[PDB]
Write a protein that binds this ligand. Structure first.
Ligand SMILES: C/C(=N\CC(=O)O)C(=O)[C@H](O)COP(=O)(O)OP(=O)(O)OC[C@H]1O[C@@H](n2cnc3c(N)ncnc32)[C@H](O)[C@@H]1O
Ligand SMILES: C/C(=N\CC(=O)O)C(=O)[C@H](O)COP(=O)(O)OP(=O)(O)OC[C@H]1O[C@@H](n2cnc3c(N)ncnc32)[C@H](O)[C@@H]1O
Ligand SMILES: C/C(=N\CC(=O)O)C(=O)[C@H](O)COP(=O)(O)OP(=O)(O)OC[C@H]1O[C@@H](n2cnc3c(N)ncnc32)[C@H](O)[C@@H]1O
Ligand SMILES: C/C(=N\CC(=O)O)C(=O)[C@H](O)COP(=O)(O)OP(=O)(O)OC[C@H]1O[C@@H](n2cnc3c(N)ncnc32)[C@H](O)[C@@H]1O
Ligand SMILES: C/C(=N\CC(=O)O)C(=O)[C@H](O)COP(=O)(O)OP(=O)(O)OC[C@H]1O[C@@H](n2cnc3c(N)ncnc32)[C@H](O)[C@@H]1O
Ligand SMILES: C/C(=N\CC(=O)O)C(=O)[C@H](O)COP(=O)(O)OP(=O)(O)OC[C@H]1O[C@@H](n2cnc3c(N)ncnc32)[C@H](O)[C@@H]1O
Ligand SMILES: [Fe+2]
Ligand SMILES: [Fe+2]
Ligand SMILES: [Fe+2]
Ligand SMILES: [Fe+2]
Ligand SMILES: [Fe+2]
Ligand SMILES: [Fe+2]
Lengths: 259, 259, 259, 259, 259, 259
């Protein structure tokens, strides 16, 4: 005999949401993009006890991972990055005739990446678009957010804000946060040239160098890093994404400690 | 120094996918819909050692859970259904002034439901649409599948099939599998009247009665059950969905054992 | 020297909105539609001290009034209904060769109707769609609401609820609330035949008879009344809309007092 | 017993509309945009007895105010700008822990701003798009108007004109009037760089400096001012918009008196 | 009495497709575009025993040939190019008052061109989009592929790869492969100016000069050649297309033999 | 040194097209649909010396064959139907563990089917939609045709006609010709119930019985036959389609000879 009431359900949702919102509008780190790089970054920062929010446009997390390679629902990871997936429980299978190369179910990975982030203490908000940055003297000091619903519906409605010590552009190929900063504030002299064509080995190894603070308060990781610094793309192999996100976390953790 | 090759990445994805496909085209149970009811059903069946596939249209699982209530990212669960979420690790918080009523993060729940299903041994395939049924004498004997990409692109391309002992319509409000069966085979005398307006208590309690075998080989659970048997909708409270999915699993497990 | 902060602006909006929401989810009367009939009804009920919310799909109130007649930005009103517009401050100009017939600026009217409603104490919420009803034994006991943004974006997100003693369908030509009730709960034997063609005099006078309780807890007024009871349409003359809304208010006020 | 006739209704609308049109095609000031800055400007100019028309694309006035902040239906105002809203009857509530900061119902504000403008004598026309300017030797001498219906329908139909001594671009973020002037007449050497990212305090204070005559006969106010002069955006706080509109009015009133 | 089974049909399609895919991901030549130039090139290369794949976006081959001239279903060919169509069985009819000029059924030609390519040993894959290139030191070493379904559906899914010694852009007017190379890797200093207006004689004769290796590993033929080198277009006369494709084949065969 | 002229190219296309059109507007048989069933039917009728035209909506022939099964580019054929594909040169490969079952490249098949039809003397016109029938006393005496361009563009342009002794609906799942006849001429008492769900063996064997003259002058073959007579669908196995088309041809050849 289940017990359920409309008013109580509605009231409960409103109370949890409004408590959540009042808390989440000031954070240590706001990561933009709930793909593999962003969710990895979120886990490793939150793991150290800092207050982290991930903002993802789509209602589901996962970014461009779900469809694997051309719809074939597996993705690839190379050592030592496989270890990052093992930490969150992902089953990995060896590739035939290839040492240190593994495949994983493209549906399993996002789920487990997200759980890792949430259980480490990161808050993941979906249906939220970062449309701009909050600025202070010589730095990025937060994000300007709107709902995916409002964006996709095309309604003329103003955004609200989340204040952050650090922001991370983990938005994938488009590097949409860095792109917006550079476009609306041209006097900063930032440029997003976009990625080069596919060269997997060069692309993967460029990511670690390209994962860094682009402007004070704003880091970039994942494919966004190679868009900002013109690295090569690498196809459906994700070790670089995970290591990039992990590295981004370590850099930001260091800066948070120094203060 | 990361090691990566385009051919090896591509080859690896192809090999894992084609092994997966050759195995998955005959199953014990094909569940249609990767929402809360479908993912719960998948866990409880796979948990007993049977071969289960979930087929979900969208690239991400989770169904209509991600947005909580009107975008406020929390959902509600009432006892004893809260216990089903605790089994998969979901954090629950008590609702103020309400006994046996809990809220949960609307992003956390789908992630953990999916992990539960997959770790129990269920295979979850996304970007797959069930467009029809495979029939035998007096029963449903499988599903007719196409890709979401092909559907959304509008391309005129034929489906393939997955053979199953049992099929479950866990497709939500539309009851799209039962609806298709009844529409294309009118001589079966099936009808999908659709749900009634909102009455949460009546809706929740109708679900258990409405979770059943609609035609031999075809079960229904979740909101689809109330669409097929004209139960009330209940709003953003999910205990009924979880219990319905669990019950559906138990019914089907019993039938599989009897054979 | 203006003082402004992002966090404070955001916090302030969140606090006012969440206080508003927690209060508004239980009301005496929920009026659906912020057109001329709905806004008039709202004023006359709130004026008597009852707790009223108007729910309007579009971000602006006003319904189908703004464009006047075929874009010519004037609407017409006939006595004694002109008196209802005078009560909210609308300037009226006599029509040449016609006694008891006036024109009014089609932009002025909605503005002043809305102010009248708000200053009488009615809450007007825009960007909100009533998609269904909350039911109890033999009656309508509230509304099921979602955002226009979510509807127009096509996102699969559950609604929340507002509990009410009375609901009013003031949704215009479509009578969308009565239509939904009748469609989803066919055993109630309700039908919405839709309006007849234009006969202004017959249409206007049918409205008063057609303004009534269609099912316990659910009233209808404005053009919705003639859609439900197959009255004629009347063109860009609005006296009937105002009187219908006023009458609807009086009927509901009486029922609230009797309890 | 209501009296209504189709021919009389139609005739009445035609007569009022055509009288209105013949009068409105020559004005002192044509304000483009019926948002908060434009409606404030309109009130303060009309208040001094000058002939003002506001031209707004959408059928409703209000611009980007209705949805508050990310759909939460409240907006913020800081002193002394709160006084401008009090003049038109808006209820304001103090923000907790913040002096000189208030919230207001995002539906109430547009309604009351519009009433203020109309009751001061400004004419507000909606469903009208300014697509270009009328030019004379070294100045803007009017606006080129079409209907929103014609624009949105994509029909190839010529515009008509309203002659004005002064035109005001109060079109918001896009600064669409100044942008069009600069694009079609490049030899004027005007440029619209567009706004910078969010810095609320700097954005708000830049508005007063940025509210000015961009080219003889053409003023800019509201967010359009910061688009033209590359000021920062400020989020859902509106004091700057109101003060900008008020200042724009005072500047133009002075110029009208000097002649 | 026909014999048919769902599982066997599905299994058979999966086995043939996965064998095909594992073989086709490394080739001698990957031709992009299954129009007249691409299909001619494919025949003449495969004819010499090399491993060739043609990748075509649309589900059918044929490119822009099917509609003839403005829907009139005939195309034109001039000597000696007519001989290339005779080799694949196309019926040709002399044009009245014109020596060495022939018409052919615009539906017959693509069919026979495709058969010629396939029977020579070329594999033609349709519904496949080349979205990028695989690069090595100073050359193009393969293609980055996705499905047309995924592209047209707008899904965020990663591509896979086909390794090749040589790639051919036979994509028609857009020269989409060379364009992508030049856009994403600007430091290569490639440019695609696009075709000039129509001058048939000059356009046809420019093609042979313009058919060449644009960058090491990447050839161009057909209309793509005149887009890359700013040749004139020629209208619905195709001799240049066939000769260009044939020449492209000969050049690449020579390079393959030299190694 | 290629010779090409714009006027001569244009003139040549016009002359061939207009000769073609003047000839093709009266035929023995008009087959609607250039899929596998229609192209097979066309070959076997034209082979006997009769005047046949195939009318296909899309610019390419092939119907729903190109994509194989869910994009995997192979289709299946069972004996003795494999013999029909061997007659037109298609390479077939045996399915492992299955006697009398073969796979074929889904791109090769349409090409070779089309060549078979054309070389047998059938005219195939693409980009042509049959929108209606020409009627005489108790029979269908031709087809009403428009262009796909006109249909897809939505232009209000009248059709023209092709006179035929027999018309064949080979339009696939929709049975669009029979459907149109039955819809517009209800007094004929025709009905198109549509196909049943998938049962491959029953679907394949129903086709031969269902391939027949539905109304005097109008035959049906391919999947259209099972739509008209409520047979089962069979998935991506095509033997039934080929045999159905062949049988349709034989029936019509017999009727032509008897006259
Ligand atoms: C390896 C690879 N490609 C190789 C190749 O193509 O050769 C990939 O594409 C990987 O998926 C890249 O992973 P990565 O974590 O870098 O990005 P992703 O998966 O695309 O995730 C980014 C996420 O960010 C989201 N997003 C975008 N912009 C915004 C915004 N302004 N606000 C909120 N969210 C936003 C977007 O929806 C997405 O979920
Ligand atoms: C409680 C509630 N509502 C109360 C109220 O509204 O008042 C809900 O709406 C719940 O979300 C319902 O849960 P439930 O597990 O029943 O369904 P869901 O969440 O909608 O998930 C079903 C899933 O099934 C998917 N789906 C649909 N049809 C197909 C198809 N033919 N093939 C593949 N997948 C398909 C669809 O994408 C969706 O993800
Ligand atoms: C006199 C006349 N016509 C004569 C003739 O045509 O001959 C008119 O059309 C009048 O405008 C009718 O006035 P009335 O007050 O009856 O309606 P209106 O102006 O159309 O306002 C109704 C409002 O209700 C809104 N609405 C609709 N459905 C929903 C929903 N389900 N939830 C939330 N809001 C909804 C809708 O957006 C609209 O704004
Ligand atoms: C404070 C803030 N943002 C902060 C932030 O984003 O960080 C805002 O966006 C405010 O709403 C800005 O107020 P403001 O009065 O400047 O503009 P608004 O509200 O956008 O109103 C302008 C109106 O003008 C209209 N309009 C546009 N272009 C034309 C045209 N060519 N002809 C006719 N009308 C037109 C347009 O439809 C709109 O209604
Ligand atoms: C003579 C003439 N015009 C004269 C005039 O207009 O004056 C023509 O237009 C001829 O058709 C040109 O023949 P040609 O073989 O050069 O090209 P085509 O017929 O357009 O075929 C190219 C094919 O290539 C395809 N394609 C494009 N881009 C991609 C991609 N990125 N990946 C996969 N396939 C792609 C495209 O779909 C098309 O089918
Ligand atoms: C076996 C199978 N399915 C099994 C399953 O799904 O379970 C199939 O779908 C097969 O492709 C069916 O082959 P068949 O030759 O019957 O049909 P098809 O391939 O769909 O070809 C019909 C053609 O006819 C065309 N067409 C449609 N209507 C019109 C019109 N009014 N005028 C002109 N042409 C038209 C249409 O565009 C199409 O190209
Ligand atoms: Fe704004
Ligand atoms: Fe089919
Ligand atoms: Fe729901
Ligand atoms: Fe013009
Ligand atoms: Fe990618
Ligand atoms: Fe006609």
């Amino acid at each position: 005999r289940l017990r359920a009431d409309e008013y109580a359900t509605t009231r409960a949702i409103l109370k949890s949401a409004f408590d959540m919102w009042l808390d989440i509008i000031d954070v240590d780190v706001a990561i933009v993009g709930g793909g593999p790089s962003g969710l990895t970054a979120a886990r490793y920062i939150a793991k150290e006890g800092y207050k982290v929010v991930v903002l993802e446009r789509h209602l589901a997390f996962g970014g461009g991972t779900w469809g694997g390679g051309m719809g074939f629902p597996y993705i690839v990871v190379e050592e030592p990055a496989d270890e990052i997936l093992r930490e969150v429980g992902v089953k990995l299978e060896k590739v035939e005739g290839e040492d240190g190369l593994y495949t994983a179910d493209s549906v399993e990975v996002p789920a487990k990446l997200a759980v890792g982030a949430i259980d480490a203490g990161a808050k993941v908000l979906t249906g939220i678009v970062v449309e701009d940055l909050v600025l202070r003297e010589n730095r990025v000091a937060g994000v300007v957010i709107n709902s995916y619903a409002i964006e996709k519906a095309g309604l003329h409605i103003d955004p609200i804000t989340i204040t952050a010590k650090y922001v991370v552009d983990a938005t994938g190929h488009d590097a949409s946060v860095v792109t917006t900063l550079s476009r609306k504030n041209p006097e900063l002299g930032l440029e997003v040239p976009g990625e080069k064509s596919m060269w997997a080995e060069k692309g993967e190894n460029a990511l670690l160098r390209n994962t860094r603070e682009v402007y004070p308060g704003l880091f970039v990781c994942g494919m966004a890093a190679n868009a900002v610094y013109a690295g090569h793309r690498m196809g459906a192999i994700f070790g670089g994404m995970y290591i990039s996100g992990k590295k981004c976390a370590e850099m930001i953790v260091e800066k948070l400690k120094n203060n």
